[PDB]
Amino acid sequence: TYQVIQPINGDPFIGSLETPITSSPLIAWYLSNLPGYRTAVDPLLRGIEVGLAHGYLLVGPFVITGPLRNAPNHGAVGSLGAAGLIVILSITLTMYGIASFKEGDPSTAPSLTLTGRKKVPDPLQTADGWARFTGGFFFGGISGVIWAYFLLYVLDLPYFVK
Amino acid sequence: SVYFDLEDIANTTGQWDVYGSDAPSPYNGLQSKFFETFAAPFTKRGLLLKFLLLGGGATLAFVSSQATGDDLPIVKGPQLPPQPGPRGKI
């Protein structure tokens, strides 16, 4: 008949399976267009995008659920907490990069596509690439926290939940 | 029909990049130049770790030292007369 689930890349002895969750064209395109999988571009810009998303998303919970949520100063306090969390995350990223990558070693990323075509391995899995990524992450996260604060409590836009 | 090649161990063991994309940069040139210029100082991992740890510690200490009684109940202090002890102790 017609079966949907197939072995990964046609190899039945690799510990994975091809399912609509993992191999559908829409999800494949979406994952390929995320900054974490853009192999052929400077990791600094990708880290900028990642930090801009994450620091922006982190503002809400700190501002609204925090201890000073009912104070008139709740927005600034929550934004400061989100910035501190971004700083801690950047520290963790730097620690991982220092522990994982030596300066002279080449990339640990795969050099083959699913079709067996040779490609340039991702420079994100090198010391310099990871350093650029975490610097971009810090710069983007601080900017995203500041932008969320500016949109919520400097222009005071009529957001339903603030 | 065969998935075992001695000349290609990466293909044999599944060393593939599944969602990796080799497409060019989708970002605008001016924006990339701006970010490259203004994020360059943070790309030194040795400097970044020391700066983050020391500056974060100093900022935490400074903010804790500048907190008022409105922000922290511990800074406000007691406002009520103290309770007495079980058998007259103070």
């Binding site: 220092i98 522990a99 | 770790l49 030292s65 907190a67």
Partner: peptide
């Protein structure tokens, strides 16, 4: 005076620095 400065240092900053140093030590080689 001092407690407001010292408590964050001993409770947060010093453990973080020590953890980072120890992790970098144990991940060596």
């Amino acid at each position: 005076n001092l407690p407001s400065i010292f408590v964050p240092l001993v409770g947060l900053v010093f453990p973080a620095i020590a953890m980072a140093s120890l992790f970098l030590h144990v991940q060596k080689n």
